[PDB]
Amino acid sequence: SGGALDLKTQVQTPQGMKEISNIQVGDLVLSNTGYNEVLNVFPKSKKKSYKITLEDGKEIICSEEHLFPTQTGEMNISGGLKEGMCLYVKEMMLKKILKIEELDERELIDIEVSGNHLFYANDILTHN
């Protein structure tokens, strides 16, 4: 997929939490449906970034096209993901988006995973 995540975003492997900048092809990352294999690590890219903050405090930084599962299907900021909609947090609990804050241009990275193409990122369910 298009878009990307902050380098310091944490994902859960069987060997513990890893920053996504350290993920390699063949790693396993936890989703709502078990561990998905990392099939690709696409090139790092500089993009405008956005911070999403949920009502439980959890945060994630991503690009405008990065997708998240919602009750209406996958959505991104460019496609109208906004405050007052809910994301899923570990384990499939709905939490309101309190804020979406545009930040700065920064390096981001993008991976592809197997299975349902999802993984928990800072304990927020996200699409690859």
Method: X-ray
**Strand ranges (E), 10-115:** 10-13, 16-19, 28-31, 34-41, 45-54, 59-62, 86-89, 93-109, 111-113
Number of domains in the chain: 1
Report the C-alpha gap between 101 and 53 in whole angstroms.
8
Give the structural domain span for 79.
1-128
Three-point CA angle 81, 84, 89, nearest 5°: 80
Which of the 8 DSSP states describes residue 117? S
76 within 8 A of 68, measured Cβ to Cβ: yes
Q: Find, among 36, 43, 40, 50, the residue nearest to 125 by Cα.
A: 36
Report the C-alpha gap between 116 and 1 in whole angstroms.
13
For this entry, resolution in Å reads: 1.0
5 within 8 A of 108, measured Cβ to Cβ: yes
Three-point CA angle 126, 81, 72, nearest 5°: 75
In this structure, the number of other CB atoms found within 10 A of the CB of residue 97 comes to 18
> Dihedral angle at the C-alpha atoms of 5, 12, 99, 105, nearest 10 degrees?
-20
Q: How many helices (H) and strands (E) does the chain have?
A: 0, 12
Which whole-number Å values give the CA distances from 45 to 14, 57, 89, in the listed order?
27, 27, 26
